[PDB]
Amino acid sequence: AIGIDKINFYVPKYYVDMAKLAEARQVDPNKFLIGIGQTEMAVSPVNQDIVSMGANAAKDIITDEDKKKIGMVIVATESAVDAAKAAAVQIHNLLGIQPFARCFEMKEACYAATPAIQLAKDYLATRPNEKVLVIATDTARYGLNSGGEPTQGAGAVAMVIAHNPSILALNEDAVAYTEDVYDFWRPTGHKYPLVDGALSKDAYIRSFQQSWNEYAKRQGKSLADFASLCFHVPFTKMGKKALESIIDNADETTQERLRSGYEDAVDYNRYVGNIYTGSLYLSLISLLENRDLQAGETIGLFSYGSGSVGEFYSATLVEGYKDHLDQAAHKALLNNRTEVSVDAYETFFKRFDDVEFDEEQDAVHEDRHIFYLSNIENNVREYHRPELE
Amino acid sequence: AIGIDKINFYVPKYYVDMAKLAEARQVDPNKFLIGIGQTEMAVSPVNQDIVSMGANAAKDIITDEDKKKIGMVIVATESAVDAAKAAAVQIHNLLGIQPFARCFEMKEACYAATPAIQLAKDYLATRPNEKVLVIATDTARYGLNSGGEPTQGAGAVAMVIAHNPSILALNEDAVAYTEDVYDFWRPTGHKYPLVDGALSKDAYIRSFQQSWNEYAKRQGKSLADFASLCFHVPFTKMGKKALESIIDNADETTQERLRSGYEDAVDYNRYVGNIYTGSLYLSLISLLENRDLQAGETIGLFSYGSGSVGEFYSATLVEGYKDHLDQAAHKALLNNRTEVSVDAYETFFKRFDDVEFDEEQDAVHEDRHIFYLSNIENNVREYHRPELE
Numbered sequence: 001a002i003g004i005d006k007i008n009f010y011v012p013k014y015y016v017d018m019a020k021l022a023e024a025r026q027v028d029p030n031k032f033l034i035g036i037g038q039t040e041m042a043v044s045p046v047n048q049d050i051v052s053m054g055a056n057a058a059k060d061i062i063t064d065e066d067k068k069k070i071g072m073v074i075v076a077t078e079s080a081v082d083a084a085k086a087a088a089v090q091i092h093n094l095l096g097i098q099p100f101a102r103c104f105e106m107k108e109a110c111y112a113a114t115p116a117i118q119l120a121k122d123y124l125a126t127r128p129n130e131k132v133l134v135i136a137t138d139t140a141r142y143g144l145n146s147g148g149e150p151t152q153g154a155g156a157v158a159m160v161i162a163h164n165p166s167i168l169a170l171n172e173d174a175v176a177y178t179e180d181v182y183d184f185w186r187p188t189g190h191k192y193p194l195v196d197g198a199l200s201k202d203a204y205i206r207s208f209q210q211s212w213n214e215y216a217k218r219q220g221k222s223l224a225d226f227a228s229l230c231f232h233v234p235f236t237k238m239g240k241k242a243l244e245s246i247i248d249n250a251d252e253t254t255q256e257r258l259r260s261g262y263e264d265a266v267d268y269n270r271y272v273g274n275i276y277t278g279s280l281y282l283s284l285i286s287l288l289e290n291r292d293l294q295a296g297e298t299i300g301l302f303s304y305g306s307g308s309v310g311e312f313y314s315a316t317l318v319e320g321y322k323d324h325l326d327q328a329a330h331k332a333l334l335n336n337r338t339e340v341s342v343d344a345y346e347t348f349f350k351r352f353d354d355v356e357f358d359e360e361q362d363a364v365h366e367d368r369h370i371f372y373l374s375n376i377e378n379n380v381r382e383y384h385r386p387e388l389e
Numbered sequence: 390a391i392g393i394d395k396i397n398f399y400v401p402k403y404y405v406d407m408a409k410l411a412e413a414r415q416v417d418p419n420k421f422l423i424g425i426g427q428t429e430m431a432v433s434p435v436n437q438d439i440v441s442m443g444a445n446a447a448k449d450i451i452t453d454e455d456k457k458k459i460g461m462v463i464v465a466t467e468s469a470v471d472a473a474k475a476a477a478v479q480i481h482n483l484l485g486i487q488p489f490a491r492c493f494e495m496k497e498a499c500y501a502a503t504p505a506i507q508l509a510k511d512y513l514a515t516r517p518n519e520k521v522l523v524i525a526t527d528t529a530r531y532g533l534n535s536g537g538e539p540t541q542g543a544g545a546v547a548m549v550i551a552h553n554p555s556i557l558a559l560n561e562d563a564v565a566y567t568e569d570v571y572d573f574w575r576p577t578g579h580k581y582p583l584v585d586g587a588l589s590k591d592a593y594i595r596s597f598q599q600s601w602n603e604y605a606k607r608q609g610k611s612l613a614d615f616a617s618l619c620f621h622v623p624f625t626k627m628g629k630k631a632l633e634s635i636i637d638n639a640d641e642t643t644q645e646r647l648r649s650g651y652e653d654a655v656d657y658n659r660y661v662g663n664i665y666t667g668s669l670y671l672s673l674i675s676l677l678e679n680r681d682l683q684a685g686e687t688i689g690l691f692s693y694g695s696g697s698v699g700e701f702y703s704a705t706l707v708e709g710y711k712d713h714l715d716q717a718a719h720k721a722l723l724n725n726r727t728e729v730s731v732d733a734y735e736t737f738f739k740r741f742d743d744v745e746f747d748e749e750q751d752a753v754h755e756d757r758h759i760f761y762l763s764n765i766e767n768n769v770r771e772y773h774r775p776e777l778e
């Protein structure tokens with residue numbers, strides 16, 4: 001079998017309390033906490049770009065042996081920093097991976113990480129001793145006082161795909177669904193995305209229903225066959241509406257189980273926000289660590305990308321997977337962050353727009369053990385490398 | 390066997406004479422004709438963007454049956470018009486391909502179409518009745534009076550990957566090579582690429598030598614084993630220098646053959662210019678149609694992307710491939726174009742920068758049988774479809 005052998009995520013060291021953001025935006029805190037379903041929003045310091053966040057997510061799950069066996073590094077993002085050079089190239093360099101590897105980016109809104117791991121699996125079919133590194137990295141920025149502001153976030157998720165995966169085996173049952181719609185998009189030159197709020201929810205749910213229906217038909221399966229589902233998470237309130245749209249034909253036993261699985265799956269996302277390509281996979285991590293699913297059980301996954309493309313596929317838990325997760329590290333990552341005021345958040349936000357370096361505001365001295373953007377000279381980004389290196 | 394079943398290209402209806410461009414830039418025409426090795430430069434009218442060019446390249450090689458079997462549409466480009474929405478989604482819509490397909494973009498400078506077709510092959514390994522559509526589409530724009538201006542071009546190449554390919558079987562011997570270098574890149578916000586002319590030369594050749602050397606070692610092969618080599622073509626002279634850098638250990642019979650093959654491979658490119666991701670594949674079309682290679686013979690291909698990533702792999706000619714090409718149509722495509730003066734070219738160029746529509750200057754009435762960008766309303770691009778639909 002081939003699948004996810006290792007998985008990890010990274011989010012910036014700052015966050016803004018959603019209740020505080022609500023107060024600053026003149027709305028009832030529960031509108032954000034319950035209405036949208038978010039609790040803490042990741043805030044990006046200038047010294048963390050998609051390259052450094054991606055490197056930080058992958059660094060803790062790649063051994064010296066893995067560096068010799070990785071044949072491809074694929075970066076999924078819709079927050080690129082170059083129109084030509086793939087961020088996968090810089091990350092491959094920062095991680096010290098062997099040279100004879102393919103490095104490139106995949107793009108399609110929040111969907112890109114899915115074809116990356118699926119095609120990584122196809123690539124590995126005839127290469128039992130190789131591995132593939134897939135990294136989802138993004139900064140969901142809508143703008144101060146914008147409609148999408150409350151759903152903002154930033155982070156990266158790294159996955160190592162290989163034979164005899166220690167965590168999840170990817171099954172051969174994926175089915176995608178494409179439909180040309182303008183629910184969310186970002187033309188060249190626009191700093192923030194254009195969005196048709198209401199339309200985005202309809203497009204999202206339709207893609208899910210169409211993808212699921214075809215999958216059920218082709219595989220002769222039903223929701224009762226899954227221990228849990230795992231979806232893309234722009235915000236928990238979204239995934240709940242999508243969930244209820246179909247469980248609406250499932251028996252009571254299945255409904256209770258899938259609803260419970262969902263809460264476990266979006267637990268971590270509630271404290272981060274939308275991280276685009278990485279949302280579904282951050283939710284996968286949350287599900288694997290917060291729930292006690294048994295080996296051999298199957299998870300049903302739905303990946304979405306505005307524009308739009310959806311895909312439903314399944315994966316099976318591998319015997320002993322709990323021993324290959326880093327729940328303590330992940331809980332620590334989230335708890336060790338520092339809360340910043342809305343005012344401070346707005347200042348950070350504006351500085352990020354123009355990559356305005358400030359080593360004191362970004363408290364760079366604290367980042368000795370991680371990768372971070374240190375400066376830009378002659379249009380070339382320079383990165384600080386972990387001191388242990 | 391799995392490989393290229395159908396292949397075609399599209400370039401805009403205008404071009405500027407390189408001798409004329411030389412006179413306007415105050416340089417000897419031969420500097421361009423022989424020095425760089427280019428004769429005519431493709432010129433982009435505003436009504437041709439990467440989406441319409443891509444659709445035009447694919448439309449003549451997609452049958453109603455293919456539309457039902459295509460499982461993925463992958464667009465390779467470094468000239469994206471949206472930071473989130475993949476151009477593959479619009480092309481999938483324009484071509485009327487069945488809905489249950491993956492659509493996304495791949496990015497890594499001029500390298501992206503290669504992992505696209507290679508992974509398309511891997512995807513098809515267990516899907517005997519499916520096909521994959523790969524489209525390389527780009528606009529190489531350096532700027533008026535810039536160092537790279539003479540190498541400019543625009544166009545798209547479409548390839549249908551399938552089982553029992555009618556033209557070329559892709560062999561299982563690919564090897565890529567990645568090395569972080571800033572020879573060419575384009576930070577977000579930059580209309581044109583930043584380039585280190587001299588460095589780009591060395592980077593291109595080093596990538597080729599490193600990739601070829603590892604390929605030769607892994608396969609136990611030599612240049613004598615190839616009927617011809619096919620490379621990425623930013624400009625003919627480039628590929629000649631790279632070529633001479635290794636043939637420099639080949640016998641005389643091999644040197645004569647590979648040099649002759651190179652001339653056949655860059656024939657079409659001389660009249661178009663650099664089309665980034667599509668250069669290597671436009672050269673492949675040129676080689677297949679201009680040379681009389683025999684079934685069973687093998688071609689060695691080198692793909693390059695600044696940044697940088699290179700890859701060397703081989704493909705074998707299928708019996709009867711000549712009956713599946715479209716040489717007459719291709720000669721017509723190039724011949725039916727209209728020459729524009731340098732002043733007109735500069736006017737087109739400046740208009741393209743701001744997507745300034747002008748139905749008379751772009752002469753849209755002439756484009757009744759092709760796809761073209763007709764307008765942009767509320768940040769959404771609208772396309773004219775062939776009237777035969």
Ligand SMILES: CC(C)(COP(=O)([O-])OP(=O)([O-])OC[C@H]1O[C@@H](n2cnc3c(N)ncnc32)[C@H](O)[C@@H]1OP(=O)([O-])[O-])[C@@H](O)C(=O)NCCC(=O)NCCSC(=O)C[C@@](C)(O)CC(=O)[O-]
Nearest residue numbers: 028030031035036109110147148184197200204234305306
């Ligand atoms: C998400 C919206 C539309 C929200 O927009 P909004 O106006 O800020 O909030 P709302 O008015 O839409 O509703 C908030 C909810 O809170 C409730 N509420 C009201 N007051 C209270 C109160 N006092 N206490 C408790 N609850 C309260 C209210 O009733 C409502 O519940 P609902 O209508 O859902 O049942 C907006 O912020 C937005 O446009 N979001 C960003 C876009 C987005 O996330 N798209 C949807 C998903 S599409 C997707 O996943 C693709 C994407 C986004 O990732 C892009 C890509 O793929 O790249």
Ligand SMILES: CC(C)(COP(=O)([O-])OP(=O)([O-])OC[C@H]1O[C@@H](n2cnc3c(N)ncnc32)[C@H](O)[C@@H]1OP(=O)([O-])[O-])[C@@H](O)C(=O)NCCC(=O)NCCSC(=O)C[C@@](C)(O)CC(=O)[O-]
Nearest residue numbers: 417419420424425498499536537573586589593623694695
């Ligand atoms: C290509 C350069 C460097 C040329 O720059 P230039 O200054 O315009 O011309 P040159 O000075 O470099 O030399 C022109 C040649 O003409 C000769 N010459 C001189 N006068 C005469 C005359 N009267 N009669 C005949 N010949 C004459 C002269 O001797 C020389 O021959 P060479 O040095 O090669 O032997 C520049 O235009 C440039 O920067 N090009 C764009 C970048 C590029 O194409 N890079 C090379 C490959 S990198 C690649 O393939 C990646 C890329 C570019 O596609 C990016 C991506 O991946 O996305």
